[PDB]
DNA sequence: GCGGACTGCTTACC
């Protein structure tokens, strides 16, 4: 097979590389790499090297990497540009792997681990590592085995061996319910001393050295704890065995040279597109996998002592949970894909700037072109997208339209790149271009309304490389949408399931079901169908991960143009994109309004009610009215009608409008592709209002079709409202959403019934479910003798109240700076001495003060502040009442 | 005694 790297590092004048060879074997080599950099040279000098602007350069070979970096400094002292890739390991990878890397993931050692540390005096600080490590579970992807290291003898208690027989038993049998599919994969090792455990773990590590190292919070806890514990016990030289090159670099984070650490919490935060109230593994596992919380009696600091059996079982389970989350989300696969595509260290996938620098560098190197030197720039603001101010109101029938990959398509259309800049023109006010009254900027170059002109013959490296990734994105989105469409087919077949014993069909959910498959589905059992729906949704999530993160990468290339740390930073190019974007949106709003007035036979009516960046929301009341609501059989009938109308009439008109804009700006290629997104409206013959807007970025719609996916049941599309915010209490989100569902689908009366019921019963809701959530930043900034300082935020005040309440209890959970907290208001005269209290999110509040918090919660404040105020906002906007008003009719019986 | 204007903070939407 073709060779591929695993890890690369620079240590002095040496490049240390771990790699898989042509026979599939892992090897390590130290290479005294000789890098090249470039300097501008006279035009009369024969060379094959040119910078991106076409100026000739000469290549300077250096005896070692130190001589190259010293030359860079000297060139700085002279005042001349030192060109070329200054990150020598990226240069090394590019030289060593001068082809498209095809890798075999089964050859890559991915290690998932988690440690346990009993601490009687609070959270065990990794920098101190003063407590024994009493458990390590380490899963190896190559062995497919869970290696379990169990400390039997500790100063905090001597325990019996963990029993795999009991671990496998059901909870109802007094077992631990360790999943049956990993029982035979567990390799259990008890130890009588901590030193012997750690020594063996190091020997194990040497034999099975991770390439990718992951787990939950491994970078901030597990890795530094293990490193510091081993260092404190055996000495630094022994601790350095954690690095395959014996080099490490040190609240601290340890860099293990020759290992690529991908902490799963960081992968999840970057790639999941969620914002969670808590990031405990417990919480995320429940959210992602729908598994129950790992229950136990007493505190964690005594779990090993009281129930060591469960203690070890939960350690193993914790490792497995991350594997299960990755099997669903596939962020490891994404990191490997992106990393090898860019030819970077795998951990550099967290940095889109490093990623794009490497992609562009490799692309330019292929043509013997030389990259410019990074330069220092001051941070400056620059304008972004346009957002229309909507008239707050209900909106019955709505169709939306969105542009495909907007900013990257602008880049490709206008041909925006550092080296395709051609000149400038004199700008007219933006609305002059929008209304097509300003003179055509250029009949030679491709232009943006910010004043920039670009060559339209030349291939730009930014357009070229963004197109390649965009093409990957488009493929994966197709798989995602098909899996989604396949999902609805299965959901509708769950309305008439057969009573028989069969099996789920063997199909590729990435492609639309054939008629044969669909026929078989209608005769399938409920058990088989539910299993198919599961596999369909899993296939959809896999596609979603792949497509939405390639979308993120290409949008981050736009973003990088506005980042001073980017080698190709240029506010001329960044603004060219956003300004063109503002023009395109407002241009097509006009075209859409014009076309719809023409087909509806009216004049001057506003059809576009809202728009943000690249989307428009079209009021379709008059389209429905022209055909008359009476002529429709059911809801699905008018949905098909609007689907057809948008597809056969509106979209061709939109394409005509954009083609004209492309000619207006003399652009290189028409790539403004705006298709229908959502069809929204109330159920036919209902009192539902269909949708409403309260303001910019705040609306709700009752959607029947989304991007070609015809829902089995109508799905609420809610943006910006409190239902969508992690800060809103769980039970309030749920209640507010039901309020919205009733408004959009059923009407005012239905809303009023539900509200009355909620108000009556809400005090019985669990305290966690009605707690607000907030991030805890700068606690110390507002701490004045344990009391709130000037301008102390509400949630920070709650934390200070908590701290005073648990003062003198070394066992009580501490609020961690930067993490999230649950927040509850307190009734007047409470023993806590303040109007609110906060505690670490994702946890029960400590038993020390739990009963008193429950007693003093302010349900009245909770209701009117988190529930009623947002509800008042929704309903006044939609022009209705959540509560029956007083009338002259009240004087009757 | 507190409404309005302004500020910091948080978390959305694109
Ligand atoms: C979501 C997002 C958008 N944007 C900008 C660039 C996007 O092209 C533009 C439009 O937002 P989107 O319409 O949400 O994203 P998109 O048009 O790029 O991709 P899609 O085909 O799924 O619609 O907003 C960012 O800069 N960063 C982001 O994270
Ligand atoms: Ca021993
Ligand atoms: Ca879009
Ligand atoms: Ca059937
Ligand atoms: Cl796409
Ligand atoms: Na742990
Ligand atoms: Na059970
Ligand atoms: Na130490
Ligand atoms: Na779309």
mmCIF file of N, CA and C and ligand atoms in Angstrom, chain A residues 114-117 221 315 318, ligand 6:
data_model
loop_
_atom_site.group_PDB
_atom_site.id
_atom_site.type_symbol
_atom_site.label_atom_id
_atom_site.label_comp_id
_atom_site.label_asym_id
_atom_site.label_seq_id
_atom_site.Cartn_x
_atom_site.Cartn_y
_atom_site.Cartn_z
ATOM 1 N N UNK A 114 -9.377 6.579 30.512
ATOM 2 C CA UNK A 114 -9.972 7.336 31.595
ATOM 3 C C UNK A 114 -9.375 6.811 32.889
ATOM 4 N N UNK A 115 -9.107 7.706 33.826
ATOM 5 C CA UNK A 115 -8.516 7.296 35.086
ATOM 6 C C UNK A 115 -9.461 7.621 36.224
ATOM 7 N N UNK A 116 -9.256 6.963 37.358
ATOM 8 C CA UNK A 116 -9.995 7.298 38.561
ATOM 9 C C UNK A 116 -8.994 7.691 39.635
ATOM 10 N N UNK A 117 -9.325 8.737 40.385
ATOM 11 C CA UNK A 117 -8.502 9.202 41.497
ATOM 12 C C UNK A 117 -9.387 9.530 42.697
ATOM 13 N N UNK A 221 -7.326 16.842 32.340
ATOM 14 C CA UNK A 221 -7.230 16.061 33.571
ATOM 15 C C UNK A 221 -6.365 14.804 33.491
ATOM 16 N N UNK A 315 -15.866 2.950 35.560
ATOM 17 C CA UNK A 315 -14.663 3.413 34.863
ATOM 18 C C UNK A 315 -14.591 2.812 33.458
ATOM 19 N N UNK A 318 -17.417 4.324 31.293
ATOM 20 C CA UNK A 318 -17.072 5.680 30.872
ATOM 21 C C UNK A 318 -16.231 5.684 29.597
HETATM 22 NA NA1 LIG C 6 -12.963 9.138 35.634
#
